[PDB]
Design a protein around this ligand. Structure first.
Ligand SMILES: C[C@H]1NC(=O)[C@H](Cc2ccc(NC(=O)[C@@H](NC(=O)Cc3ccccc3)C3CCCCC3)cc2)NC(=O)CC2(CCCC2)CC(=O)N[C@H](C(=O)O)CCCCNC1=O
Lengths: 96, 93
């Protein structure tokens, strides 16, 4: 394995045609504990007229992203990096 | 001040489409970060052309990153916080 020391002390989108809100997920077995991800606010995208148009799709932009899982489980001071997927926002796409 | 141990062993149809810019810092983990850059200023018509009645804007986000301490160090870092462009959405002015 590849062990390193890390020190833990450290160093508007409403206009969108595919707007979104944030939802909460807590896991006290990883850092950061509490993660907010984007859930699209509608299924279609917004018109110049201001109506939802279901011939277009709001879809979540899914990013790959690293976190620390306690290893062993329930450890204050030792971890691995795990790779997870997280919604950072939504964009409007042309369907199939 | 508090030190821990870490094992390092782990679309294109958008009206506001984006690209990939590469960002590489030898003093960083990870050293390779792929940022987003919007391809256009405006967004894509039903006609498949670009009109400037809407705007393409990046989605900025704060992330944590490993900065070598001391510098040039193979096995010792501290957390550092940066902005990164992580996608592009179409927005109304
Ligand atoms: C929007 C919402 N915030 C969230 O939910 C998101 C969730 C998030 C989770 C994980 C990450 N991953 C990383 O950064 C990791 N990097 C990478 O993968 C590197 C990378 C980059 C690009 C491409 C590939 C890979 C690092 C890797 C090393 C281990 C640590 C994590 C990012 C975001 N961000 C927060 O919580 C804020 C942060 C995390 C970013 C800096 C500060 C934690 C904090 O100090 N949060 C503050 C706190 O604790 O008080 C503020 C909390 C309230 C605000 N929260 C909110 O409103």
């Amino acid at each position: 394995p590849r062990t390193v020391m890390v020190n833990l002390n450290i160093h508007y989108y409403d206009r969108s045609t595919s707007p979104w809100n944030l939802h909460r997920n807590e896991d006290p077995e990883r850092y950061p504990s509490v993660i907010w991800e984007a859930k699209c606010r509608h299924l279609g995208c917004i018109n110049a007229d201001g109506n939802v148009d279901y011939h277009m799709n709001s879809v979540p932009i899914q990013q790959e992203i690293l976190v620390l899982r306690r290893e062993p489980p329930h450890s204050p001071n030792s971890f691995r990096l795990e790779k997870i997927l997280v919604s950072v926002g939504c964009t409007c796409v042309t369907p199939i």
